[PDB]
Every structure is written in C-alpha cells, then in structure tokens.
Amino acid sequence: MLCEIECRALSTAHTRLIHDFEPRDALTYLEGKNIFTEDHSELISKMSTRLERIANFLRIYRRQASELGPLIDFFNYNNQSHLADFLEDYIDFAINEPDLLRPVVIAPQFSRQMLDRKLLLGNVPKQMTCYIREYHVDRVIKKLDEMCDLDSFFLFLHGRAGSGKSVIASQALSKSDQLIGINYDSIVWLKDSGTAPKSTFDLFTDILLMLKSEDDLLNFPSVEHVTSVVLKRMICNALIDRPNTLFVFDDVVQEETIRWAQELRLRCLVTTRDVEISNAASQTCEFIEVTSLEIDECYDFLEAYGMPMPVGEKEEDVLNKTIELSSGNPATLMMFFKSCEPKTFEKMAQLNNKLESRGLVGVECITPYSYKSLAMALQRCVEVLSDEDRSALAFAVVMPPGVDIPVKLWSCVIPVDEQLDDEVADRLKRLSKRGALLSGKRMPVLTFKIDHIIHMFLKHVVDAQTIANGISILEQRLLEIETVIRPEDFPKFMQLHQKFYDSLKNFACC
C-alpha cells in the first residue's frame, strides 16, 4: 500500500492525469510488476467513461502496490513522460530535499479558481469581507502552516458565543492560497453542535460521506445501523485516498467528538465555546482564543460597514455605551448595526436604552448568525454547565459588571455544599473556561469580572426571586467587624457600586 506522501503526489498531479493518460495503457505494463489481479484489471478494463478507469486505477493502485515505482516506470515508456517526470520530481523534492517541496514542485500550479471549488466542496462557508480581524486570521494561518507536516493535531479556535470564531476560520481558509494545495490537499468543514450521544456518531457518518466519491453516493447502505468500530474502520479505509486532509469541526460541544478525531488520527481545526474538551486529547494541542473585541476594533468594524463617526462628545459616549454594553462581541454588535434603521446616532442611543430595559430581546434581529439574539446561544452554554456551576453562574448576576472584584466578595453570594472558600475560585474558573462567561485576572489580587453582555443575559433570564435573595444574602456579610481595586479596608461598603444595584432593586419591584 502507499501512504499520505505518495498519494499527495497522485492527488496533486490529477489535472494532468486527466489531461493526458489512460489506465488501459497501463494495465498490461502493471499486471506484470505484480500490483494487480484479474478482477482488478477486469474492473478497470471495462468502463464506459475514462474518469471511471482513472478513479478506479488510482483507487486500486493506492492499495495494491508495495511502492510508487511501476508508475514512474510507465508514463515514461508511453510518451506521457511529461507525467512521470512530474512525479519523479515530487518524490525527489520529498525524500532528499524537504521544505523545498512547497515552494518548488507544489506552488507553481495554484489558481484562485480551483480554491473556491475545493472550499465549496468541503462545505466551507463564505468568508466575511467587509471587515477582517487581521491578527487572529493571520495567527491561525501561521499556526496552521507550522503543523501541515504533522500527521494529526488539534488547533482549538475557542471563544465566547457570537465571539466570531467560525467566521475567522472561514477567512483563514479563504485568505491564503497556501493552506489548501500547498500545505494540505483537501478540506472537510462540518458543523457539529451535537448534544445527543448519537450525535457524535452521526457526525462521523457525515464525515465518512463527505469523503465518499460522487460515485457511491448512490450506494450508501443502511449505515445508520452499523457499529462504531465499523464506521471508524470504514473511514480510515476511505481516508487513504485523502492525503493531508484538513478537518474543520465548527462548534464542537461534546468531547466525544475530540476523542473520535484523536482515535482517527485526524488533522482538526475546532471552533468551540467550551475550551476544556481538549483535555480529552493526549496530544499536540494548540490553542487560539477569540477574545472580546477591543474598543478600537469596534470603531474599525463600524467604519467598515458604513457607520457615521461621532462629533459631539455625547455621541462618542453613545458609541462607548454600545461598546461597553455589547462587551466587545461581534454577533450582538452586528445585530445592533442591522437594527439601527435610520442610521442616526440618535436611534443608536435609542437601542442603547432598549438594551437595559428589554435585555437582548430589545435588539434581537436577523443576522448572519444562525441566532435571533445572543441569548439563544448562551442558552446551550448554560444548560451544559455542571449543575453546581449552573448555580454559580445563576448567581453572578447580583454583581457589578465591568468591575474587577475579589473572590471573598464573591464567596458571599455563591453557594457550596468551613473557612477556606477557594472552591469559589474553582467554580469561577470552570465558569470562564466553559463558554467564557467570567474573566480571570491573577494578580494584584485574585479577581474575576463579569462582562456586560453576559450580565443582561442573566438579568432578563434568571428566576425573578433569586435576584432579590442574592441581594439580601449579600447585604448580610456586608459589615462584619477606577483602575484601582477596592481595598480590604473598604469591602464592608459595596456602596461604591450603588448605581448598578439601584437598578436591580428597581428591577425586582416589578
């Protein structure tokens, strides 16, 4: 049998094996060097069209030969030497001189019209254009280039919900011309979003089918009912014809996915919200985190789609209100733009009002996002949470948002089944790690922070009682004996943050 390199040569050189070649020319020259069987030769000798004999010749061949010898020693004799010269060039710029393979024998055939074909067939979504986050898409492409040599690896493009990951992966496979063709031969981009335990198998059923030829899409068996060991084996079978194949797994939630991907020694891009699923993999794991949009990038994003820039001071403030509110978040910012109707800064501040007095439902809109509002997204992220973590999250409402605050100050509202409350930190870490709901900040003092979007989610979403109960349960511990953290000489009075508390207490008498 061959391998990924020799098949990368047989795959790279296919436009040519289509332009000048015929498997009938080679069947006779090859039954001799011991690489066929009279059914093999039967299967390839009687075929109406040639792309059939070629696809059968390359399939049967990649399985039959001990090596890629008796195919160089043939395009030569048949005056189709213009082929065997290309393949001997690739194998030579492969065993002896590495690296040189991508610049020399692979690149001089790139074509910005073949890509779109490969992207489309791998079901890659249309990269976004009117604004591109330079940094991230760049670092993704960089870190993908660094690993194309590798046999199997995980790149985790993880972030908040609506934080913009999938779009960035769409762009990262659409910017360069290198990643597909130069570094990897093909792309398979599949959205997971699997929650059932059957979901993790159905996915790879559709991988297995993303792989299968347009021929024998007709032949699909009752594979719906067939063991996991067999779907797996059927895949690693049909995976021979796929040299350097990249897998985008858009929106993975279950670590069962990651376990299959790592049993299947796959090359995986993974967009996800819960970052800890990587603990499933004992392997080369590399990570790229899509943070919340910085204050300046938001400007760039607005300008990018035609939004009028401020003049008055209370207009730049209106927009810093939006940026503060949608704590740097692509999806809700987009819903925001899409919902700004007259385009005026005025109706933009109107929405800035609407967000506090109606939550995300005030600006929920039709957006390139599959979701009406970021709450439909956070939904899942909140259901999946360990029941106790579900509790901690349910309580972090009664905090101040966009304020950095100590752990003990959290120990007050947060539940637990003694005197050391570090358990709070353990939960708050799982909590930021798993949907990017919190925010960890190690020194000066161990502190977390709840952002603004992740708050007005909980506002119009948690049980109306639990708010007022957390507020009183807070006012109890509240007494015992700016870019500056609140000192331990001054915790007894959280009254500094009375405003965003006067707002919940007004909220809870309704």
Partner: peptide
C-alpha cells in the same frame, strides 16, 4: 423555576 427555561 431556576432559569426562565434556561434562556
């Protein structure tokens, strides 16, 4: 209730 139908 403990979550308005989880969101």
């Amino acid at each position: 209730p403990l979550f308005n139908f989880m969101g």
